[PDB]
Amino acid sequence: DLHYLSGFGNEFASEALPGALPVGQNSPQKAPYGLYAELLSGTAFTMARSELRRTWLYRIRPSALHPRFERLARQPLGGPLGGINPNRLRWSPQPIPAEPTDFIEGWLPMAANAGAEKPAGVSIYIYRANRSMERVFFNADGELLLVPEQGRLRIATELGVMEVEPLEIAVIPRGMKFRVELLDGQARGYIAENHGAPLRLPDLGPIGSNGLANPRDFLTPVAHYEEAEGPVQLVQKFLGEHWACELQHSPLDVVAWHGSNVPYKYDLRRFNTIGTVSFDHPDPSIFTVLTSPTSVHGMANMDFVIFPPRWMVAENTFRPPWFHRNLMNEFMGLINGGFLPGGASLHGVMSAHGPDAETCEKAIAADLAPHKIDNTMAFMFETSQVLRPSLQALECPQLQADYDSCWATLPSTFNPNRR
């Protein structure tokens, strides 16, 4: 029975004790309950207000109260970049490791725009974990988009507690402290780490003022603070590296807060899917849930896109996705329903992809009538920068060695003598 505040991008305000929030100002000399005011600035001060992300926290002890960070010996993300490889790639789902592995220890580097030491654009991982985190963590390297596939997550953050289950997504702003509890003992899922402009709702164009992901469905947890006394490890990811310090208090000691730099979750089942109600096959940008822009208008750092249960009604139309060569880079995953839940495919810049022969023959031969796609949920992380597969990803047992064969049996159907 966790409570949530609704509305993407809102100036929220939540207090765990009556009047814990200062009224009419952010920095009283005598803060209610004797709390410390702290500002979390997720963007430059001078952004246009529409881009502004900042949260005022009123907490038991300042975040400044911490000893020196030291580099952990254990570094899940220190593996090298893979060699150059233009090929189409597909993986089978990643098995959960035997060794104890919490949420942060479990990120397996799949592909990234840059080396972990110079975070830029987007880095993509698959997380595997068999332990709840017995420590607190923040990412200095970017925003985190989590896409669960197996197992629920109870995520306790500075702003409050949220639970996410497969078919839901969650986002945790850069630098925000959080701790992940595995409700089901173990967990698997995907991560897009956003090193760039924070994820937001796409420009709707002609779709207008409603549709796709409705702002009312983005939920942010209410204030919740901890009073545990005794040592707690605080871990941060900085330029790919986990550095840690030990606190003698719980860093999740925020009693009240206000602002717009907030963790949130969204249920993909609430997506107001838009598609063709006539013919043809619309561009997959139409399925956009969240997007991270660049200073180049129209070209996203990354678009998060889903392929949800939907009605198929295209008349006189080849209904599967058409054959395609793309400037952008397509990383596909599957949440449920050769491509299994937990699996992945990377078709990079100008790689030729599309349906196989059996998909083609069946689509061309189909008696086209309205059809409901159901019990499936796929998605794509599409990035503008090339995604370089990690060495780990290219060498792991789960990489399919004959993925190219999927297209081998495509036939010519060309007859010059009959249109």
- What 8-state DSSP symbol labels residue 208? T
Beta strands in 27-142 (DSSP E): 36-41, 54-59, 70-71, 89-91, 107-112, 122-129, 136-139
Residue selected from 205, 230, 231, 397 as contacting a second copy according to rule CB under 8 A: 205
Which H or E element spans position 78?
none
Sites for a second copy among residues 105-164 (CB under 8 A): 117, 138, 140
- Helix (H), strand (E), coil (C) string for 114-138: CCCCCCCCEEEEEEEECCCCCCEEE
Give the CA angle between residues 10, 258, 183 to the nearest 5°: 85
Question: Least distance (Å) from a second copy to the CB of residue 126?
Answer: 23
* Spatial distance between the Cα atoms of 56 and 21, rounded to a whole number of angstroms: 9
- Quick check: 228 binds a second copy (CB under 8 A)? no
Residue 363 binds which of Fe ion, a second copy, none (CB < 5-8 A, kind-dependent): a second copy
Which residue is associated with the tokens 């605080």? 234
Residue 336 binds which of Fe ion, a second copy, none (CB < 5-8 A, kind-dependent): none
Q: How many CB atoms lie within 10 A of CB 73?
A: 6
Sites for Fe ion among residues 304-333 (CB under 5 A): 324, 326, 330
* Spatial distance between the Cα atoms of 389 and 396, rounded to a whole number of angstroms: 11
Question: Least distance (Å) from a second copy to the CB of residue 399?
Answer: 12
Residue 258 assigned ligand-binding role: no
* Spatial distance between the Cα atoms of 80 and 392, rounded to a whole number of angstroms: 8
- Quick check: 98 binds a second copy (CB under 8 A)? no
Residue 258 known to be catalytic: no
Token reading at 34? 């004797």
Residue 297 assigned ligand-binding role: no
- Quick check: 135 binds Fe ion (CB under 5 A)? no
- Quick check: 54 binds Fe ion (CB under 5 A)? no
- What 8-state DSSP symbol labels residue 287? G
Token reading at 259? 């602002």
| Per rule CB under 8 A, count of chain residues that contact a second copy | 160
Q: Which is nearer to a second copy, 130 or 345 (CB)?
A: 345
- Quick check: 96 binds a second copy (CB under 8 A)? no
Which residue of the set 195, 281, 297, 347 is catalytic?
Answer: 281
Handedness of CA 208, 210, 215, 218 (dihedral sign): negative
Residue 395 assigned ligand-binding role: no
Q: In terms of Cα–Cα distance, which of 11, 7, 6 is closest to 54?
A: 11
The contact mask relative to a second copy for 336-355 (x = CB under 8 A, - = no) is ------------xxx-xxx-
Sites for a second copy among residues 349-388 (CB under 8 A): 349-350, 352-354, 360, 363-364, 366, 368, 370, 384, 386
| Radius of gyration for the alpha carbons in the chain, expressed in angstroms and rounded | 23
- Quick check: 230 binds a second copy (CB under 8 A)? no
Piece in contact with a second copy (CB under 8 A), picked from 46-54, 91-99, 121-129, 332-340: 46-54
* Spatial distance between the Cα atoms of 72 and 84, rounded to a whole number of angstroms: 30
Residue selected from 92, 226, 324, 392 as contacting a second copy according to rule CB under 8 A: 324
- Quick check: 61 binds Fe ion (CB under 5 A)? no
Sites for a second copy among residues 266-305 (CB under 8 A): 269-288, 294-300, 303
Sites for Fe ion among residues 242-271 (CB under 5 A): none
Residues with a catalytic annotation lie at: 281
Residue ranges binding Fe ion (CB under 5 A): 324, 326, 330
